[PDB]
Design a protein around this ligand. Structure first.
Ligand SMILES: [Zn+2]
Lengths: 128, 293, 227
């Protein structure tokens, strides 16, 4: 089919950008969890901001993320869904996950099982 | 504060070796500039464009601030900077500014021709433009080109020590300097003493009188040594140590540590500056509410 | 009969007549994250002013007694107050460990490379940093340390504590010098201290991820030589 070339020289600028993205995601998640465990929604427009800036960096470097991150974050307001509104299933569709802002992220789960994403398949992925 | 940024080094080519008599003479003229009074000295070194630049890292600079001038500093109480004036006449194959610039502190130029003067102001990242005051001006200095170069950065530099060399050179010196002051619109004028000996040194009030008799005003002369002199030092000092005037490895203390003033407290090995734990995030609030410092 | 006609050339013509004359609830907040962030940083300042008023009404200078006083007598006012004691470990440890991982700062310090480290700091984000105003055009801005909650274009947002003050502090960047310490894991032997200037970069962090910074005229930096 073609040529099989596997390079492990990772580039320094891509490592800098992904460390920046991962640091923003970690600080937003830790703000959200440290606020959520203790008391009510104090600075929930704050951490979301980081995620939004994170996604804007994903516009600049043109990089892609795993569907775990994009499944965690929202699409319109770009907030973390670690505490969502409601989860409904088999309500004449497949699945529905409601949020506080009203934007839902649903999944076709009632069609068939054993469907995996392209990054979750057996051999398509090499860690580190 | 006073800056004298054109003291020459007694060497022109890398094949030549400086004798100890010239080094002792430079020690005596630095003691001379410390005797009456000055604040900053940036010693200059000359290379040509058609020479063979060495492919080294720690051998590009025969300046040695650490071993000999570090011993002179403790009895002196001043500082030295190392700088290069680029003698460029034709666009030849020689281009190694990424090493010669980052090795030294201030990058200057000495153009002789027409196109070189244009490509120096246009593309070459330097700090100062020095002209050959000993010889003739190349063709003409235009107003809008030099004005846009000053608005871009780089200022013009007048060497009042070159008139103290010979008798015939004074006429060409004044004929160059009046044209420089006229075409520069009195914005980018930095003055320096090109003396190879302590026997040609002057005081501030005599250099001010020289600048008066050349055609530039007096308040603008002292402003050129206070404002314009120490800013073009900081330009090259931030360009070569730090990023392109973006993020600096220099400690911002109250009145003792500065990128210009605290040279010895910065490790000049690569970049770094070893600073003790003066910032504690635990129990330090507003500055006026502290009690331990 | 003079050429300088004041009333004629401006007030009475048809071209300069336009010139002044010579005789003369939860969903609506988080629709935009920026506007909700603005409402939050306004609400924190208003709650800090109300906290100062209730602190003068309390007449107790201790802040640990003041927080319990607000918890006892003002429940709804206490809900929007910041917690700096919580803010320090949740930010400083992550920031220091991220810089120790990113800039390759390890136990071996003799293999360091400064230019690539400054390039990484030009590529790294400052969201969550402890930063100190060391020099400024204003004499009152200096001496302020604080941790970033958000990066703006030309201003800077930190938080600092006083005796009883817990106000969100906005500081201009045009004409200020900032510094931050990078500690090393050894105790009291060696540590690093870097500096930035907020007047030099005047863009968003989104643009800062892509922009390659170039030289400037740098004429307005005389204050850094002055003070
Ligand atoms: Zn949502």
């Amino acid at each position: 089919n073609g040529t099989l070339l596997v390079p492990p020289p990772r580039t320094i600028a891509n490592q800098d950008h992904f460390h920046r993205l991962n640091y923003l995601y970690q600080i937003s998640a830790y703000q959200t969890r440290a606020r959520q465990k203790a008391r009510t929604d104090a600075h929930t427009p704050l951490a979301r901001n980081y995620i939004k800036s994170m996604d804007l960096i994903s516009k600049k470097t043109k990089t892609s993320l795993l569907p775990t991150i994009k499944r965690t974050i929202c699409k319109k307001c770009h907030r973390l869904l670690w505490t969502p509104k409601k989860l409904e299933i088999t309500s004449d569709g497949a699945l529905s996950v409601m949020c506080g802002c009203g934007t839902v992220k649903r999944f076709n789960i009632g069609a068939d099982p054993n469907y995996r994403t392209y990054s979750e398949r057996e051999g398509n992925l090499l860690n580190s | 504060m006073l800056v004298d940024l054109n003291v020459p080094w007694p060497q022109n080519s890398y094949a030549d070796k400086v004798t100890s008599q010239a080094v002792n003479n430079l020690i005596k003229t630095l003691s001379t500039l410390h005797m009456l009074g000055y604040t900053h000295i940036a010693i200059n070194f000359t290379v040509n464009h058609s020479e063979k630049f060495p492919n080294d890292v720690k051998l590009l600079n025969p300046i040695d601030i650490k071993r000999r001038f570090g011993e002179l500093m403790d009895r002196t109480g001043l500082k030295l900077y190392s700088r290069i004036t680029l003698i460029i006449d034709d666009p030849s194959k020689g281009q190694s500014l990424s090493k010669i610039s980052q090795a030294f502190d201030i990058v200057a130029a000495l153009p002789i021709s027409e196109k070189g003067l244009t490509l120096s102001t246009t593309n070459l990242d330097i700090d100062l433009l020095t002209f050959q005051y000993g010889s003739r001006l190349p063709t003409f200095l235009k107003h809008k080109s030099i004005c846009s170069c000053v608005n871009r950065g780089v200022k013009l530099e007048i060497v009042y020590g070159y008139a103290l060399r010979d008798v015939q050179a004074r006429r060409q010196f004044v004929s160059n300097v009046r044209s420089v002051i006229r075409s520069s619109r009195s914005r980018g004028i930095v003055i320096g003493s090109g003396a190879m000996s302590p026997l040609e040194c002057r005081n501030i009030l005599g250099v001010t009188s020289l600048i008066k008799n050349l055609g530039l005003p007096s308040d603008r002369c002292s402003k050129a040594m206070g404002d314009l002199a120490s800013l073009v030092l900081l330009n090259g000092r931030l360009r070569n140590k730090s990023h392109k005037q973006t993020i600096v490895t220099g400690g911002g203390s109250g009145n003792g540590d500065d990128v210009v003033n605290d040279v010895q407290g910065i490790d000049d090995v690569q970049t770094i500056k070893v600073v003790k734990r003066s910032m504690d995030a635990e129990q330090l609030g507003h500055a006026s509410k502290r009690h331990k410092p | 009969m003079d050429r300088t006609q004041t009333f004629i050339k401006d007030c009475l013509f048809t071209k300069c007549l336009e010139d002044p004359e010579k005789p003369f609830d939860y969903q609506r907040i988080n629709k935009n994250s920026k506007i909700a962030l603005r409402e939050y940083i306004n609400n924190c300042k208003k709650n800090t002013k109300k906290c100062l008023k209730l602190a003068y009404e309390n007449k107790i200078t201790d802040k640990e007694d003041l927080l319990h006083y607000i918890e006892e007598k003002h429940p709804t006012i206490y809900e929007s107050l910041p917690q700096y004691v919580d803010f320090v470990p949740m930010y400083k440890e992550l920031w220091i460990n991220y810089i120790k991982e990113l800039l390759n700062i390890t136990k071996n310090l003799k293999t360091f490379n400064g230019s690539l480290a400054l390039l990484k700091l030009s590529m790294a984000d400052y969201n969550g940093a402890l930063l100190r105003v060391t020099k400024s055009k204003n004499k009152t801005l200096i001496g302020l340390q604080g941790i970033v909650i958000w990066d703006s274009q030309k201003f800077f947002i930190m938080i600092v504590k006083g005796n009883i003050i817990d106000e969100i502090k906005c500081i201009p960047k045009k004409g200020t010098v900032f510094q931050f310490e990078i500690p090393i894991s050894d105790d009291d032997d060696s540590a690093l201290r870097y500096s930035i200037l907020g007047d030099r970069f005047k863009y968003r962090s989104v643009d800062r991820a892509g922009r390659k910074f170039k030289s400037r005229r740098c004429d307005d930096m005389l204050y850094y030589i002055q003070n």
